[PDB]
Amino acid sequence: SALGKLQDVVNQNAQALNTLVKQLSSNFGAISSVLNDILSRLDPPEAEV
Amino acid sequence: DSFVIRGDEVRQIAPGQTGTIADYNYKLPDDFTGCVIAWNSNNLDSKVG
């Protein structure tokens, strides 16, 4: 634990990147989190929503 | 744009509708602005034969 200050910064940056990438898997109330699935399953009036 | 259609087809003169005259006769855009006007014309556009 001598080098904890640098490792803390590295861990925080990697965790922020992992969280930002992970947030793509969330649908945020939509039917799916995949854009291709929505574009292939629905008409543009509701796919737009 | 003036035409004569059936009574059940007046729902198809709208953005984002699936239907027959919507696809092959008269299509409205999704960003359509304006008014659709429909009235019964059985006394004028109909014959007993």
Q: Does B29 touch chain A (CB under 8 A)?
A: no
**Are the C-beta atoms of A43 and B16 separated by less than 8 Å?**
yes
Question: Degrees (nearest 5) of the Cα angle B13, B49, B24?
Answer: 25
Q: Rounded to a whole number, what is the distance in Å from the CA of A44 to chain B's nearest CA?
A: 8
- What is Dmax (Cα atoms) for chain B? 41
Resolution, expressed in angstroms to one decimal: 2.8
Can you read off the two tokens belonging to residue B3? 């035409």
Interface probe for B, chosen from A43, A46, A49 (most Cβ of B below 10 Å), is A43
Q: Does A44 touch chain B (CB under 8 A)?
A: yes
- Residues B18, A43: C-beta atoms closer than 8 Å: yes
SS3 A14: helix
- The separation between CA A21 and the C-alpha centre of its own chain, rounded to angstroms, equals 4
List, in sequence order, the alpha helices (H) in B1-49: 20-24
The span from the CA of A35 to the CA of A14, in Å, is 26
